[PDB]
Amino acid sequence: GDDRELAILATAENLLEDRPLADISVDDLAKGAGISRPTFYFYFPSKEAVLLTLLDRVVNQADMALQTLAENPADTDRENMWRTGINVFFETFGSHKAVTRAGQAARATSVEVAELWSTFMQKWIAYTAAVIDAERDRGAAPRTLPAHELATALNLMNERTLFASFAGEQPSVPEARVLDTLVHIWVTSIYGEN
Amino acid sequence: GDDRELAILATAENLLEDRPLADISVDDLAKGAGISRPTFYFYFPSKEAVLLTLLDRVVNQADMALQTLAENPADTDRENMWRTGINVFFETFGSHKAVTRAGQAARATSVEVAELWSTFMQKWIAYTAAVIDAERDRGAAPRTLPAHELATALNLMNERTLFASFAGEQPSVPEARVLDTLVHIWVTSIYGEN
């Protein structure tokens, strides 16, 4: 029963490796899950709804991993703090490229997908800004840009730059260079007096 | 004759202020241009092709304005140099929000639109990297990240962050704050030793 829902999700993730959601039919999904098409419709109203659930799982896995980090002491220098935090997103979405690619595309045609992404981006921006505020309050970071606006730009850079790297877009930073690139820009802009 | 092509382009830009390309018919475009539908088809094979031409015009206007700056002496401090350069993009695309918004959407469904955008992004990244290289060669900027990878991330941040601001996305930096935000991040990451 839940095996059937999970089988549908796994099929969808597999199939998305090789083709876009448009090129995947409910029949394909039902076939791979070892169920009929009307049984599929018991579990999901559409193939679009299966993508939403896949993306919700990955997004929540990233969010939970960040929350785990936030709850640690984790004694290391400031650069290494930002790196471990950005690395949560690099590894989580990097482990789920087909879902990442499919989810990004579906922001344009799905209000629930756009809303899911927006809700989590606002959360991650708020956490970034709160950590910046703490760094300022302890005297480690200078009071330059408004912390929330800084957080916003840096998070949007990550969104676009991680994605370009994972998709192999032209232009893109090689995936093997993107962590180091993002961390440099976060650290110099957060701690830089100029 | 060219008046007719330009009339079609102007109509399309006007209509895109209020609705997406999907919600605009060839009939609407022909109507606004004061021509018949088959006359329209003489000028453009599709409404999609009209968008491509609009975007090509804006993109080339940004590119030409940047080339003009590059060809100036323009005696000012380094922060102000980057600001005037980023400001080319802020003003050009900011003056053409409907075309910007429509073009961004069409990257997903149009290979010519994706290719146009990619070609210019590669150009602007290469120019950014060349200016960074010059700053390093004169001893003004430190030899930190590979200049082309740095340029790439900073340009992608601008692409996504300018666009979020112009679209009024949640999350976004207010349009009245985005220039200052981008310039801070470019200047600290280019000149920052850490």
Ligand SMILES: O=C(Cn1cc(CNS(=O)(=O)c2ccc(I)cc2)nn1)N1CCC(c2nc(-c3cccs3)no2)CC1
């Ligand atoms: O990268 C992000 C947020 N983010 C995540 C993404 C995902 N990019 S992506 O994979 O290409 C993607 C794009 C679109 C879609 I739909 C799905 C995925 N873009 N931005 N961060 C970096 C680290 C920030 C942070 N770290 C920390 C700490 C580090 C160490 C201790 S606390 N505090 O805040 C939180 C948000």
Ligand SMILES: O=C(Cn1cc(CNS(=O)(=O)c2ccc(I)cc2)nn1)N1CCC(c2nc(-c3cccs3)no2)CC1
């Ligand atoms: O911002 C960019 C490139 N860019 C432009 C954009 C457009 N963003 S946008 O408007 O939201 C948009 C997004 C998507 C689409 I389709 C159309 C528009 N994104 N990135 N720059 C900043 C300045 C860089 C530069 N300045 C300079 C100099 C400054 C002063 C002397 S030389 N040299 O390189 C060149 C590229």
